[PDB]
Amino acid sequence: YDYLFKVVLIGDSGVGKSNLLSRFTRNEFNLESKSTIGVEFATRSIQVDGKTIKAQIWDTAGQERYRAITSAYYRGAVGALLVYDIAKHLTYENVERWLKELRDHADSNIVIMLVGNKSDLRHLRAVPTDEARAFAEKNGLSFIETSALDSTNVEAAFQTILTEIYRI
């Protein structure tokens, strides 16, 4: 590979972070996945502007009550996938909180992609696509909706953020 880019997954418990990771790196999905224990990471190489980018994707539980995610989790990260669940409005309301965590614990110029996951649950949607896109636009974030379940836009989400990082 030509470059190694560390990218972190963050977002509330249950939004689909671990399945976004497994879908992208192993093409695997699990309806019966449990809350993540400690910290995990996995890799996949992809082509970006004629270069081979080894994407090192980090993952951890969204809940931070007794245990808060430290600057060590974010160290070296050049991107963050900030994931919410399109069918749960609270997870979108908490995006502001995750942005604060990034400001507190992550690099100043970390590339942020706001990810509305579970787009296959369109019939249960609680967060309008236009509102989220507008919010992203107004806060200097990229935006995409994904479904780890049916694979829609998962490759595109990672390919796009890794492209934006490469092109900084």
Least distance between Mg ion and beta carbon 36 (Å): 3
Count the Cβ atoms, other than its own, within 10 Å of residue 28. Answer: 11
If one asks whether residue 79 binds ligand GNP (CB under 6 A), the answer comes out as no
Part of the chain binding ligand GNP (CB under 6 A), chosen from 12-20, 72-80, 102-110, 156-164 = 12-20
Question: Cβ of residue 28: shortest distance to Mg ion, in angstroms?
Answer: 13
Sign of the C-alpha dihedral, residues 33, 130, 64, 78? positive
**d(C-alpha 150, C-alpha 116), whole Å:** 14
Angle of CA points 146, 149, 153, to nearest 5°: 25
Question: If contact means CB under 5 to 8 A according to the sort of partner, which of Mg ion, ligand GNP, none does residue 88 touch?
Answer: none
- 91 with 124: CB under 8 angstroms? no
CB closer to Mg ion out of 18 and 160: 18
Using the rule CB under 6 A, which residue among 6, 17, 88, 105 binds ligand GNP?
17
Amino acid at 64: E
Look at residues 79, 98, 77, 101 and name the one whose alpha carbon lies nearest to residue 163. Answer: 79
Is 80 a binding residue for ligand GNP by CB under 6 A? The answer is: no
Does residue 168 interact with ligand GNP by CB under 6 A? no
Does 42 help bind ligand GNP (rule: CB under 6 A)?
no
Footprint of ligand GNP (CB under 6 A): 13-19, 30-31, 33, 35-36, 61-62, 117-118, 120-121, 147-149
